[PDB]
Every structure is written in structure tokens, then in C-alpha cells.
């Protein structure tokens, strides 16, 4: 138990090191409790006004690439801090990151979301949900269920301590395709899961079944990533020559 608390604290410490924009920082921005106000993008005119941050919907989605590549870098830093991670076979670390990063990006995306919109570029902007919903199909339908997931995930009131371990658990998923040595992965995960269980019991003592809800949220995130991947397949079927950051080419390769 005590060692499980020591591991929880170590993970929160690294998450703090690795991720500049914490959930706590983000919620402070979203509730005006902070530091300069985000610029609001609610229509085409405010969008072109805020550009210092192809057809519009492709422009908006392709501009997420800069952030996603930074996030991968952050997530890699955080993964390396998880005890046991760097001692795993190197190709298995790559595998874990390859199939993990988007789950973690959507996890952190929820932290930047409320029912009305999403923070962008380190909180310097706020894109509204209605604006995103007005985009041409299939783009306009895509984010809606992301907001839905975020609103329910945020209702659980996890903090950064909680999230750090939740994230560690996800990265140490033994079932990613083509992992060469699964057992040491699972042994790490099993211990993380115990740290998470205790973390949730001490930190959310009135919250019935939180541990199990969180397991289900990991399944929801796989589903969300499956959908994210199919949005890009659908769009590649007509946007033949669409630039893609080389880091992300590695991640999307084979999917």
C-alpha cells in the first residue's frame, strides 16, 4: 500500500514534469480563474481573426497536427518515467507508444473541454462546440461524441494525481498488436492498476464503483481512437495529397 502511494506520487511528479498544461491549469482557464483570456472562435469570421494561433474543415483538422506531435513527445517523456518502462524491449516500447498516444491525447483533450467548447494552442484559443458542429460532413459530426465523452468523463472529477496513473495504465497495455514480450508489460500494468485502485479509494471515498467506471473509459477511448482512425481513412479516400507530419506517419502507419 505504502509503496503504491509512493508510486502514485512519483507518477504525479513526472506528469507534472512532462505535461505543462495540467488539468488544474486548464479548468482554471475555462472558469475564468487565472492570466490572459482565450480568444473565442465561434464562426468563420472569428476563425480568420484568430488565425495567429484548403477548405476550412480540413484546415482546422490539419492544424491539430502541431499539437499532436508535441503531445507525443510529452507522452514519451512520461512513459520513460514509469518504473520498468525503459527496461522493456525497445521495439515493445515503440509499440506501446504507437498504439497508446492517441488514447492519451483524447484523455487530455477532455481536460481542455467543457459542454461549450475546447481550448486550443495551450489555452490561447477556445473553439466552440457549435462552430465545430457546423463543419461539413463528416467533420461536423465527429467532435460531438468527443464532447459527450468529455462531459461524462469530467463529471467524474478526476484530478491530475488520478489522471497520471490512469494514463500510465493505458500506456502499459499488454494487448497492443505485435508486442514481443507481453508478460513483463502486464506485471507493470497489474501494479499500476493496484496503485490506481488505492488512489481512487483514498481520493474519492464517496464515489461508488469509480475504478470500474474508469476501466470502461479506457474501452471508450479505444473506441474513440478507432473512430478517429476511420475519419482519416474516409478523408484519405478523396484528399489524396494531404500533408502529414513524419512523426504521425509513423503512428498511423499500418492502421
Amino acid at each position: 500500500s505504502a509503496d503504491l502511494r509512493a508510486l502514485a506520487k512519483h507518477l504525479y511528479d513526472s506528469y507534472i514534469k512532462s505535461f505543462p498544461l495540467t488539468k488544474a491549469k486548464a479548468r482554471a482557464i475555462l472558469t475564468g480563474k487565472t492570466d490572459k483570456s482565450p480568444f473565442v472562435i465561434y464562426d468563420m469570421n472569428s476563425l480568420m481573426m484568430g488565425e495567429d494561433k484548403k477548405e476550412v474543415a480540413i484546415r482546422i483538422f490539419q492544424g491539430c497536427q502541431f499539437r499532436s506531435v508535441e503531445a507525443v513527445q510529452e507522452i514519451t517523456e512520461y512513459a520513460k518515467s514509469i518504473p520498468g518502462f525503459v527496461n522493456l524491449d525497445l521495439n515493445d516500447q515503440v509499440t506501446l507508444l504507437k498504439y497508446g498516444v492517441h488514447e492519451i491525447i483524447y484523455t487530455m483533450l477532455a481536460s481542455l473541454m467543457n459542454k461549450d467548447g475546447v481550448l486550443i494552442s495551450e489555452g490561447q484559443g477556445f473553439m466552440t462546440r457549435e462552430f465545430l458542429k457546423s463543419l461539413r460532413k463528416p467533420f461536423g459530426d465527429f467532435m460531438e461524441p468527443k464532447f459527450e465523452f468529455a462531459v461524462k468523463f469530467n463529471a467524474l472529477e478526476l484530478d491530475d494525481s488520478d489522471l497520471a496513473i490512469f494514463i500510465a495504465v493505458i500506456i502499459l497495455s499488454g494487448d497492443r498488436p505485435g508486442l514481443l514480450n507481453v508478460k513483463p508489460i502486464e506485471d507493470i500494468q497489474d501494479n499500476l492498476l493496484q496503485a490506481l485502485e488505492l488512489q481512487l479509494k483514498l481520493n474519492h471515498p464517496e464515489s461508488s464503483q469509480l475504478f470500474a467506471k474508469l476501466l470502461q473509459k479506457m474501452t471508450d477511448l479505444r473506441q474513440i481512437v478507432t473512430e478517429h482512425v476511420q475519419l482519416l481513412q474516409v478523408i484519405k479516400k478523396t484528399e489524396t495529397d494531404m500533408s502529414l507530419h513524419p512523426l504521425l506517419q509513423e503512428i498511423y502507419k499500418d492502421l
Binding site: 514519451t76 525497445l90 516500447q93 515503440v94 507508444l97 512523426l247 503512428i251
Partner: peptide, 10 residues
């Protein structure tokens, strides 16, 4: 080669 693998070794 692999960009992830470089970020892992850094």
C-alpha cells in the same frame, strides 16, 4: 527507421 525509437533513446 523510427522517430519514436529516437525519442525513446533521448
Amino acid at each position: 527507421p523510427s522517430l519514436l525509437k529516437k525519442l525513446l533513446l533521448a
